[PDB]
Design a protein around this motif. Structure first.
Motif, PDB file in Angstrom:
ATOM      1  N   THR A 281      44.367  43.108  44.312  1.00  0.00           N
ATOM      2  CA  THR A 281      44.005  43.254  45.719  1.00  0.00           C
ATOM      3  C   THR A 281      44.891  42.431  46.644  1.00  0.00           C
ATOM      4  O   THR A 281      44.834  42.626  47.861  1.00  0.00           O
ATOM      5  CB  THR A 281      42.535  42.866  45.932  1.00  0.00           C
ATOM      6  OG1 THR A 281      42.284  41.602  45.308  1.00  0.00           O
ATOM      7  CG2 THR A 281      41.619  43.909  45.315  1.00  0.00           C
ATOM      8  N   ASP A 282      45.678  41.502  46.106  1.00  0.00           N
ATOM      9  CA  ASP A 282      46.565  40.669  46.905  1.00  0.00           C
ATOM     10  C   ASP A 282      47.890  41.353  47.221  1.00  0.00           C
ATOM     11  O   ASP A 282      48.673  40.818  48.015  1.00  0.00           O
ATOM     12  CB  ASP A 282      46.809  39.342  46.176  1.00  0.00           C
ATOM     13  CG  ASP A 282      45.544  38.493  46.063  1.00  0.00           C
ATOM     14  OD1 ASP A 282      44.621  38.664  46.882  1.00  0.00           O
ATOM     15  OD2 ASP A 282      45.461  37.641  45.161  1.00  0.00           O
TER      16      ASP A 282
ATOM     17  N   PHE B 217      42.433  49.209  34.121  1.00  0.00           N
ATOM     18  CA  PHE B 217      42.734  48.144  35.068  1.00  0.00           C
ATOM     19  C   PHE B 217      41.551  47.892  36.000  1.00  0.00           C
ATOM     20  O   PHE B 217      40.609  48.684  36.086  1.00  0.00           O
ATOM     21  CB  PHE B 217      43.976  48.488  35.884  1.00  0.00           C
ATOM     22  CG  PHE B 217      45.250  47.961  35.307  1.00  0.00           C
ATOM     23  CD1 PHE B 217      45.526  46.609  35.329  1.00  0.00           C
ATOM     24  CD2 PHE B 217      46.196  48.829  34.784  1.00  0.00           C
ATOM     25  CE1 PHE B 217      46.715  46.145  34.828  1.00  0.00           C
ATOM     26  CE2 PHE B 217      47.385  48.363  34.287  1.00  0.00           C
ATOM     27  CZ  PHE B 217      47.639  47.023  34.289  1.00  0.00           C
ATOM     28  N   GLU B 218      41.599  46.757  36.690  1.00  0.00           N
ATOM     29  CA  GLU B 218      40.602  46.362  37.662  1.00  0.00           C
ATOM     30  C   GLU B 218      41.288  45.775  38.907  1.00  0.00           C
ATOM     31  O   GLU B 218      42.404  45.271  38.817  1.00  0.00           O
ATOM     32  CB  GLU B 218      39.616  45.338  37.068  1.00  0.00           C
ATOM     33  CG  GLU B 218      38.796  45.843  35.877  1.00  0.00           C
ATOM     34  CD  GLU B 218      37.527  46.577  36.295  1.00  0.00           C
ATOM     35  OE1 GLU B 218      37.336  46.833  37.509  1.00  0.00           O
ATOM     36  OE2 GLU B 218      36.723  46.897  35.399  1.00  0.00           O
ATOM     37  N   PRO B 219      40.623  45.844  40.062  1.00  0.00           N
ATOM     38  CA  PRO B 219      41.212  45.250  41.283  1.00  0.00           C
ATOM     39  C   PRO B 219      41.417  43.743  41.226  1.00  0.00           C
ATOM     40  O   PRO B 219      42.165  43.210  42.053  1.00  0.00           O
ATOM     41  CB  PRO B 219      40.193  45.622  42.369  1.00  0.00           C
ATOM     42  CG  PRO B 219      39.537  46.838  41.842  1.00  0.00           C
ATOM     43  CD  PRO B 219      39.420  46.622  40.367  1.00  0.00           C
ATOM     44  N   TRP B 220      40.766  43.025  40.311  1.00  0.00           N
ATOM     45  CA  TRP B 220      40.949  41.584  40.197  1.00  0.00           C
ATOM     46  C   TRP B 220      41.807  41.207  39.000  1.00  0.00           C
ATOM     47  O   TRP B 220      41.669  40.101  38.471  1.00  0.00           O
ATOM     48  CB  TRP B 220      39.597  40.879  40.101  1.00  0.00           C
ATOM     49  CG  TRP B 220      38.731  41.514  39.053  1.00  0.00           C
ATOM     50  CD1 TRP B 220      38.709  41.232  37.713  1.00  0.00           C
ATOM     51  CD2 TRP B 220      37.790  42.569  39.252  1.00  0.00           C
ATOM     52  NE1 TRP B 220      37.801  42.042  37.072  1.00  0.00           N
ATOM     53  CE2 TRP B 220      37.220  42.871  37.997  1.00  0.00           C
ATOM     54  CE3 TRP B 220      37.367  43.287  40.371  1.00  0.00           C
ATOM     55  CZ2 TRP B 220      36.249  43.869  37.833  1.00  0.00           C
ATOM     56  CZ3 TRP B 220      36.386  44.273  40.208  1.00  0.00           C
ATOM     57  CH2 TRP B 220      35.846  44.553  38.953  1.00  0.00           C
TER      58      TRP B 220
ATOM     59  N   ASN C 191      35.071  32.303  33.110  1.00  0.00           N
ATOM     60  CA  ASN C 191      34.880  32.885  34.443  1.00  0.00           C
ATOM     61  C   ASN C 191      35.316  34.354  34.515  1.00  0.00           C
ATOM     62  O   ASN C 191      35.947  34.789  35.480  1.00  0.00           O
ATOM     63  CB  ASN C 191      35.585  32.042  35.514  1.00  0.00           C
ATOM     64  CG  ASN C 191      35.124  30.585  35.511  1.00  0.00           C
ATOM     65  OD1 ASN C 191      33.933  30.295  35.592  1.00  0.00           O
ATOM     66  ND2 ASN C 191      36.072  29.669  35.410  1.00  0.00           N
ATOM     67  N   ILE C 192      34.960  35.134  33.504  1.00  0.00           N
ATOM     68  CA  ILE C 192      35.271  36.569  33.568  1.00  0.00           C
ATOM     69  C   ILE C 192      34.287  37.241  34.519  1.00  0.00           C
ATOM     70  O   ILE C 192      33.073  36.998  34.412  1.00  0.00           O
ATOM     71  CB  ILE C 192      35.204  37.203  32.174  1.00  0.00           C
ATOM     72  CG1 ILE C 192      36.121  36.486  31.190  1.00  0.00           C
ATOM     73  CG2 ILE C 192      35.615  38.672  32.235  1.00  0.00           C
ATOM     74  CD1 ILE C 192      36.071  37.004  29.795  1.00  0.00           C
ATOM     75  N   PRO C 193      34.749  38.051  35.476  1.00  0.00           N
ATOM     76  CA  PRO C 193      33.828  38.660  36.443  1.00  0.00           C
ATOM     77  C   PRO C 193      32.806  39.551  35.756  1.00  0.00           C
ATOM     78  O   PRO C 193      33.108  40.232  34.772  1.00  0.00           O
ATOM     79  CB  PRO C 193      34.758  39.468  37.360  1.00  0.00           C
ATOM     80  CG  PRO C 193      36.100  38.848  37.193  1.00  0.00           C
ATOM     81  CD  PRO C 193      36.149  38.385  35.770  1.00  0.00           C
TER      82      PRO C 193
ATOM     83  N   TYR D 223      43.244  40.030  28.437  1.00  0.00           N
ATOM     84  CA  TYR D 223      44.697  40.060  28.561  1.00  0.00           C
ATOM     85  C   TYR D 223      45.150  40.396  29.972  1.00  0.00           C
ATOM     86  O   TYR D 223      46.266  40.032  30.350  1.00  0.00           O
ATOM     87  CB  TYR D 223      45.293  41.067  27.577  1.00  0.00           C
ATOM     88  CG  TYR D 223      44.480  42.322  27.447  1.00  0.00           C
ATOM     89  CD1 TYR D 223      44.601  43.338  28.378  1.00  0.00           C
ATOM     90  CD2 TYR D 223      43.601  42.498  26.384  1.00  0.00           C
ATOM     91  CE1 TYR D 223      43.848  44.479  28.276  1.00  0.00           C
ATOM     92  CE2 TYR D 223      42.858  43.636  26.261  1.00  0.00           C
ATOM     93  CZ  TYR D 223      42.979  44.620  27.216  1.00  0.00           C
ATOM     94  OH  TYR D 223      42.247  45.779  27.123  1.00  0.00           O
ATOM     95  N   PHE D 224      44.308  41.074  30.752  1.00  0.00           N
ATOM     96  CA  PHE D 224      44.631  41.503  32.107  1.00  0.00           C
ATOM     97  C   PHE D 224      44.176  40.520  33.177  1.00  0.00           C
ATOM     98  O   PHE D 224      44.396  40.777  34.366  1.00  0.00           O
ATOM     99  CB  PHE D 224      44.006  42.872  32.389  1.00  0.00           C
ATOM    100  CG  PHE D 224      44.777  44.035  31.835  1.00  0.00           C
ATOM    101  CD1 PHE D 224      46.090  43.907  31.459  1.00  0.00           C
ATOM    102  CD2 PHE D 224      44.181  45.276  31.741  1.00  0.00           C
ATOM    103  CE1 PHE D 224      46.797  44.987  30.980  1.00  0.00           C
ATOM    104  CE2 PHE D 224      44.873  46.360  31.259  1.00  0.00           C
ATOM    105  CZ  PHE D 224      46.186  46.211  30.861  1.00  0.00           C
ATOM    106  N   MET D 225      43.575  39.401  32.783  1.00  0.00           N
ATOM    107  CA  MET D 225      43.217  38.356  33.729  1.00  0.00           C
ATOM    108  C   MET D 225      44.476  37.734  34.330  1.00  0.00           C
ATOM    109  O   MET D 225      45.526  37.677  33.687  1.00  0.00           O
ATOM    110  CB  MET D 225      42.372  37.295  33.027  1.00  0.00           C
ATOM    111  CG  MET D 225      41.025  37.811  32.531  1.00  0.00           C
ATOM    112  SD  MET D 225      39.952  38.431  33.832  1.00  0.00           S
ATOM    113  CE  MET D 225      39.501  36.920  34.642  1.00  0.00           C
ATOM    114  N   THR D 226      44.355  37.256  35.574  1.00  0.00           N
ATOM    115  CA  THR D 226      45.476  36.673  36.303  1.00  0.00           C
ATOM    116  C   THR D 226      46.000  35.435  35.596  1.00  0.00           C
ATOM    117  O   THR D 226      45.230  34.557  35.194  1.00  0.00           O
ATOM    118  CB  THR D 226      45.036  36.328  37.720  1.00  0.00           C
ATOM    119  OG1 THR D 226      44.100  35.242  37.672  1.00  0.00           O
ATOM    120  CG2 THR D 226      44.362  37.555  38.328  1.00  0.00           C
ATOM    121  N   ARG D 227      47.316  35.383  35.432  1.00  0.00           N
ATOM    122  CA  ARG D 227      47.959  34.305  34.704  1.00  0.00           C
ATOM    123  C   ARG D 227      49.171  33.813  35.475  1.00  0.00           C
ATOM    124  O   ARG D 227      49.741  34.531  36.297  1.00  0.00           O
ATOM    125  CB  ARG D 227      48.396  34.763  33.317  1.00  0.00           C
ATOM    126  CG  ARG D 227      49.585  35.713  33.345  1.00  0.00           C
ATOM    127  CD  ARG D 227      49.777  36.438  32.035  1.00  0.00           C
ATOM    128  NE  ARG D 227      51.072  37.104  31.982  1.00  0.00           N
ATOM    129  CZ  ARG D 227      51.254  38.418  32.004  1.00  0.00           C
ATOM    130  NH1 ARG D 227      50.235  39.258  32.100  1.00  0.00           N
ATOM    131  NH2 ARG D 227      52.488  38.902  31.901  1.00  0.00           N
TER     132      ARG D 227
END
Lengths: 465, 465
Positions: free
Chosen positions: A140-141, A162-165, A296-298, A403-407
């Protein structure tokens, strides 16, 4: 000491046997695809004998994937003789070569990307930025709401979950890479058979607690491993020659199962791979940060997946009349693909359409009810068909989107860390160059890079095209 | 048909056996590199038994080359056991990794390209034009006098033996392709041994007069071949199943030899391959024009090449003191490389610096004289050193630069012609897409494309990259 290369010169060239292999042993934590790939690379390219390779197992007992097809070239197939896995795959692919809404109606704009000019501009902006400048940036950024309304986004978010976050770096890698008979039965079993043919040691009932590392100003050595062999906590000592390959993190760990009448309970229990990564991360900063992936996984992220098996004729006839398939109007973003079918809902903490409960609180029959509702099936014969004519088994994966969490750079440790003598990281959570996670090619490429760097094999790893 | 492909998916993939090959035979005129490559491809990829492959022989008895390394992957080496030819080449290149003037002095501007901006603009304009727009276009039709004075033109004309009157199409191919002991012992002998291992028939004392083709509006068949078997002129019949591979044209044909005391006499004697191509072109218009390559070759073109062997100490000492190597100031454009050295002169009909005779009229002793003269050796002790301390053997090739003559589309016949069932053309004079002639890669690619098109082998030919 590695280099990327391309073309038929380095593809068919057999490397020389690296020096001092005969005094080297290998210990590989886990028995995942990356672990078995690394074992096979050690057997074939590294020429390491089978007795010195140990595979520790917890439980008792597309075309441009360069590294994958490099690995599955000397792996023989199990079904047809005098052929390899790539041979069967090529022959099968040469012999034998979408969205619904309003309860069954196919989308009228199917096929069209429906990408506006601003969306194409934003795609080019995401692709043209450097990976180093995209640290800790959400989806989303970088995109506006014009792109999130396009059908291309629907296809991308359903094909790749995928997800928006999610991480912008990994979406950029996906856009760069993809711009132009499951894995267990087709890939894992032949490598198991090949390794057993070469006599690779398999130690079962082994839970690896932690690995004592020593970090000096000049070199870092895996000194020792504390494991739990068949319930007995014991320790195996290591030298510089005893290489260690850790599959840090696991996307299928702590996966609770449900059934057709009860929902699968949510959990947040950190597993053996995650605990091992946490223990390793306490020793040195350059071993990655597991907390960026397992914490902290949504709650809106993808958690529950179901499988529906049926022999009833009229549901199958309805499916044939309809036609992966995505329910566009469902609040759960349910998508189902092909007997037995597989159903996964993207959003998790949102009430469903026919049953007004979240997917976490819905049992198998409830999921079957709502999937039949969105299939266009009438609401009269829906209940008996869902409860008794089909069996739906859910399963709750708490780390299926890790694996798709922000890094950032350094959140994933390098495949072989800087100044590492005998410790390597493999799997989806090892940082590599220009490759997409959650693909078999990623795990194989990490295994190959780990083997080639640890053994100093002088053969080019095929670069990503 | 055929399709080009790249990547490791099609590289390692073994093709299925084409239908009706057990009733097909193969006849291959000549025993050049392309004919051996075709026979090897028929044996391996085509799965054709060696007894059905006939090689008719006249006389009795860089890293990105995709097709060449594709061919030399299953070919075993002859010098070391349990390795291929590509294995030997890779291991040898991993174990073991210019211009002079005014009689000995190295070029002051050596290393730098010294390409002016207008020269780069001409290079770009040549490279960005389509190949169809360059029919029968010389080099001098596309470059100015600025390019001809650059050191880059010196490197290009000495490395690749280019001339100002050559085909601009082939120069464009060379610039686009290369923008980023001998071959007989290392390549021809391993393929000869492999074919003999597989039982490929070799007929000696066979001189192929011509091939009677029948051409219909829908298909064309090689019906019959008239050959000269051991002095008896006889005829062999063909079916549609009997494939035929012709190596039209030959740059080593009709080469007269000289010695250290008499020059090699110039000649214009058409050889067997040129006669065969002339006989073939008369039958159908789309079989190419041999007259564009075998006739009206300019007299200034590269004709004579010498080899100088010596055991004398001071000549080798002088050679090592100086340091391919190019004599820029020589009127012959003489260039020599490394004992025994090889000397070749591009200009043929111009009087030399030391001896005022052209290379056609110069005997081997005279060539050694002027070669020693341009090396900085004094003009006093030159005569006896050149006549007696070294032996120079010259040879006059009248077609050593026929592949570079200006050609149009269709002057070179297709690798497999339109509506052709069993006739194919291989070698440097067969028209293919985006490959550079006078290379092993070109001959191997033509052989592979002929085999794959005629046998309908469903495997992607590695495209040029």
């Amino acid at each position: 000491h590695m280099y990327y290369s391309y073309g038929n010169y380095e593809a068919f060239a057999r490397p020389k046997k690296p020096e001092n292999v005969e005094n080297k042993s290998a210990y590989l934590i886990g028995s995942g695809l990356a672990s078995l790939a690394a074992a096979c690379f050690l057997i074939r390219d590294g020429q390491m004998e089978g007795s010195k390779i140990h595979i520790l197992e917890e439980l008792p007992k597309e075309n441009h994937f360069e590294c994958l097809w490099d690995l599955f070239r000397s792996i023989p197939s199990l079904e047809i003789d005098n052929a390899s896995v790539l041979d069967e795959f090529y022959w099968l692919n040469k012999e034998d070569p979408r969205v619904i809404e309003k309860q069954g109606q196919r989308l009228v704009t199917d096929g069209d990307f429906t990408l506006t000019k601003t969306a194409i501009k934003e795609i080019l902006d995401l692709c043209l930025t450097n990976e180093e400048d995209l640290d800790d940036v959400k989806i989303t950024d970088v995109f506006s709401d014009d792109f999130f309304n396009s059908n291309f986004w629907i296809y991308w978010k359903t094909m790749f979950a995928f997800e928006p976050w999610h991480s912008a770096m990994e979406m950029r890698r996906y856009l760069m890479r993809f711009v132009h008979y499951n894995q267990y039965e087709s890939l894992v079993l032949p490598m198991v058979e090949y390794l057993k043919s070469h006599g690779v040691q398999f130690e079962y009932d082994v839970k690896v607690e932690d690995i004592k590392i020593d970090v000096t100003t000049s070199q870092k050595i895996a000194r020792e491993i504390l494991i739990d062999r068949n319930g007995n906590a014991e320790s195996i000592k290591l030298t510089i020659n005893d290489l260690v390959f850790v599959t840090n993190g696991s996307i299928t760990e702590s996966s609770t199962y449900g059934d057709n009448d009860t929902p699968a309970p949510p959990t947040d229990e950190l597993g053996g791979s995650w605990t091992l990564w946490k223990n390793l991360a306490r020793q040195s900063p350059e071993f990655g940060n597991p907390d960026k992936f397992c914490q902290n996984i949504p709650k809106k992220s993808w958690f529950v997946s179901a499988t529906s098996t049926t022999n009833n004729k009229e549901i199958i006839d309805t499916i044939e009349s309809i036609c992966i398939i995505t329910i566009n109007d469902s609040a759960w973003q349910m998508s189902f693909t092909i007997i037995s079918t597989w159903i996964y809902a993207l959003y998790s903490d949102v009430n469903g359409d026919y049953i007004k409960k979240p997917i976490t609180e819905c049992s198998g029959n409830e999921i079957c009810q709502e999937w039949l509702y969105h299939l266009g099936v009438s609401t009269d014969k829906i209940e008996d068909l869902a409860k008794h004519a089909s069996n739906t088994i859910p399963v709750y994966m708490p780390y299926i989107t890790s694996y798709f969490m922000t890094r950032a750079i350094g959140d994933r440790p390098l495949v072989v860390p800087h100044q590492s003598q005998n410790l390597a990281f493999i799997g989806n959570f090892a940082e590599t160059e220009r490759d997409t996670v959650f693909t078999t090619e990623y795990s194989v490429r990490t295994a190959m890079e780990a083997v080639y760097q640890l053994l100093n094999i002088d053969r080019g790893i095929p670069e990503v095209i």
